[PDB]
Design a protein around this ligand. Structure first.
Ligand SMILES: O=[N+]([O-])c1ccc(O[C@@H]2O[C@H](CO[C@@H]3O[C@H](CO)[C@@H](O)[C@H](O)[C@H]3O)[C@@H](O)[C@H](O)[C@H]2O)cc1
Ligand SMILES: OC[C@H]1O[C@@H](O)[C@H](O)[C@@H](O)[C@@H]1O
Length: 393
């Protein structure tokens, strides 16, 4: 991959190897007692634990074997995409003592790498969940825990990375894998950043020490633009390093409160800021969402800030009419198309973009398929109904 000249146009294969209740609510809904959600497992840790090893494996094997298949990779290619980001949890490689997680993801990851090769699609392998959790998000596997830097969890994470490095950073997949992402979304504000930097450095060095020339992808840990400019630099002989920035405008009341023009201005400025940075950078996660209305987006048994139903947030608008894309107002469809186009322009201004995510069961703001089929995601992805919203130079 030419990170200097080529632009990544990609989708995440989210909800596949790490369960996210909002992406596959059908796997979590059976635990409901009518309208009471207090008994629904909040993450994959608790879901596998509640089910037990046998049931969890049965249900996950059906999920893994159907959620993403070769046909998805064909459709991805057909739609003009050239890339997928593949989240995977540490537990696919290594279990902590007493971990309830079941394994078997690796078989499908490797099928995926073959399907990518067959369809001329490049790949990041993304270690999306670390033992103890690096962020307390349900998508780390373990909600509301922040223990990645406690005990032996960082070392276990590095051991899992070494496994990933040896299997996937070598010659076998040199034509497919164009990045290994050390850790998805470490929650910088609650972590020791010096230790996180040392972890990134250890990972970088470990990978190169294997003889691998695979790009090392470091997530920005929610730091300000430019924060990583002086870390892992060619000045220190540290090369083939890409910063992965994630961008949304839905996870606080203040962001949700913005009018569409201001949402677009924020998206444009993501582009301007990224352009100033020293490392190659890619927007590895973003979506069309202008609300946090998707059921369980904030987590199982948590409502949406958009309708004043979470975290003492005040009401902004009703979520029910936004759950089904067939029901959207023309205003929301227009706002969505404008927002997607602004983001595309912003992200192609540097290394490109990786939409979160390829598919969801019924959350349209978060599905490349659904948005495309409804004419809201440009197809071809270069199509613009709202050209030059940002005025890039
Ligand atoms: O200031 N911060 O550092 C910060 C970090 C994160 C943040 O929002 C979190 O952001 C997390 C991650 O953002 C997206 O959240 C989506 C829904 O969980 C995931 O599917 C996407 O892959 C992911 O990129 C959310 O999971 C979580 O619910 C939400 O509270 C807000 C502020
Ligand atoms: O600065 C942009 C890029 O320059 C390349 O020569 C380096 O190998 C990368 O690590 C870096 O991100």
């Amino acid at each position: 991959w030419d990170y200097d000249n080529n632009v990544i146009r990609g989708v995440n294969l989210g909800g596949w190897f790490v369960l996210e209740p909002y992406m596959t609510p059908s796997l979590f809904e059976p635990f409901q007692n009518g309208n009471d959600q207090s008994g629904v497992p909040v993450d994959e840790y608790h879901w596998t634990q509640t089910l037990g090893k046998e049931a969890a494996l049965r249900i996950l094997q059906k999920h893994w074997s159907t959620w993403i298949t070769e046909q998805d990779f064909k459709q991805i290619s057909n739609l003009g995409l050239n890339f997928v980001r593949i989240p995977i949890g540490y537990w696919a490689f290594q279990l902590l003592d007493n971990d309830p997680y079941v394994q078997g993801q690796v078989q499908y990851l490797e099928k995926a790498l073959g399907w990518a090769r067959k369809n001329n699609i490049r790949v990041w392998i993304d270690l999306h969940g670390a033992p103890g959790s690096q962020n307390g998000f349900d998508n780390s596997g373990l909600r509301d825990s922040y223990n990645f830097q406690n005990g032996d969890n960082t070392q276990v994470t590095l051991n899992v990375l070494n496994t990933i490095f040896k299997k996937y950073g070598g010659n076998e997949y040199s034509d497919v894998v164009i990045g290994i992402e050390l850790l998805n979304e470490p929650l910088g504000p609650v972590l020791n950043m010096d230790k996180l930097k040392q972890f990134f450095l250890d990972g970088y060095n470990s990978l190169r020490q294997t003889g691998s020339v695979t790009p090392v992808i470091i997530h920005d840990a929610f730091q300000v633009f430019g924060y990583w400019n002086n870390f892992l630099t060619v000045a220190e002989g540290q090369w083939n390093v890409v910063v992965d920035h994630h961008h949304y405008q839905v996870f606080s009341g203040g962001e949700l409160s913005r009018n569409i023009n201001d949402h677009i201005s924020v998206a444009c400025n993501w582009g301007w800021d990224a352009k100033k940075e020293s490392h190659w950078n890619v927007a590895g996660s973003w979506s069309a969402a202008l609300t946090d209305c998707a059921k369980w987006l904030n987590g199982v048994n948590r409502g949406a800030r958009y309708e004043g139903a979470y975290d003492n947030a005040p009401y902004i608008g009703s979520c029910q009419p936004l759950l089904d894309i067939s029901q959207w107002s023309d205003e929301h469809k227009t706002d969505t198309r404008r927002y997607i186009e602004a983001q595309l322009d912003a992200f192609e201004y540097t290394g490109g973009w990786v939409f979160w995510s390829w598919k969801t069961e019924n959350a349209p703001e978060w599905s490349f398929q659904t948005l495309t089929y409804n004419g809201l995601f440009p197809q071809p992805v270069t199509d613009r109904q709202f050209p030059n919203q940002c005025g890039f130079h």
